[PDB]
């Protein structure tokens, strides 16, 4: 039940993959709040290139809106919409 080399290479090559990104990375300005969930499933550029000199970088970007629970202590809590950046296309470019 070994995973075939070409399937391994195709699954690992620089492409957008579901990444769990912390919300504090995307909205650091929102300090007073605690979020639920604290992180979000976003399509983010991941994987390797044919050579070590190259890095997997985003080319096409877009936004997705998501219901997220805002909690400010001594205030209460509500669910608002929040827009998050996602990577649609990826490229292997030299390290600058």
């Amino acid at each position: 039940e070994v995973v075939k080399f070409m399937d391994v290479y195709q699954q690992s090559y620089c492409h957008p993959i579901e990444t769990l990104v912390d919300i504090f990375q995307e909205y650091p300005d929102e300090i007073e709040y605690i979020f639920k969930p604290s992180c979000v499933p976003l399509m983010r550029c991941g994987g390797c290139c044919n050579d070590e000199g190259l890095e997997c970088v985003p080319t096409e970007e877009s936004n997705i809106t998501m219901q997220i629970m805002r909690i400010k202590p001594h205030q209460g809590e509500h669910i608002g919409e929040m827009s998050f950046l996602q990577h649609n296309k990826c490229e292997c470019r030299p390290k600058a």
Binding site: Q10, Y13, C14, N50, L54, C92
Partner: peptide, 15 residues
């Protein structure tokens, strides 16, 4: 056609 900046064909993994 087997540029390092592009993804895949077996007849690259020939060399």
């Amino acid at each position: 056609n087997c540029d390092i900046h592009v993804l895949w064909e077996w007849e690259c993994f020939x060399r």
